[PDB]
Amino acid sequence: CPLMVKVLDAVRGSPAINVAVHVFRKAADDTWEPFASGKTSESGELHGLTTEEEFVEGIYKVEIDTKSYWKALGISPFHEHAEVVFTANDSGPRRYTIAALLSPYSYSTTAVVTNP
Amino acid sequence: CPLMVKVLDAVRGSPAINVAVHVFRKAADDTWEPFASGKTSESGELHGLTTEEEFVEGIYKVEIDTKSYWKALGISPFHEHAEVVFTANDSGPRRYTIAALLSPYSYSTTAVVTNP
Amino acid sequence: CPLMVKVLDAVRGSPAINVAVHVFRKAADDTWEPFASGKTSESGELHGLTTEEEFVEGIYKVEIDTKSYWKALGISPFHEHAEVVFTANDSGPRRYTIAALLSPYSYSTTAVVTNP
Amino acid sequence: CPLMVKVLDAVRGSPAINVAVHVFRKAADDTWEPFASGKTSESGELHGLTTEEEFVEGIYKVEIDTKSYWKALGISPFHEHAEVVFTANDSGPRRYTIAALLSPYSYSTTAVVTNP
Ligand SMILES: O=C(O)CON=C1c2cc(Cl)ccc2-c2ccc(Cl)cc21
Question: Could you say which residues bind L-thyroxine here (chains A, B, C, D)?
Answer without folding.
Answer: 6, 45, 108
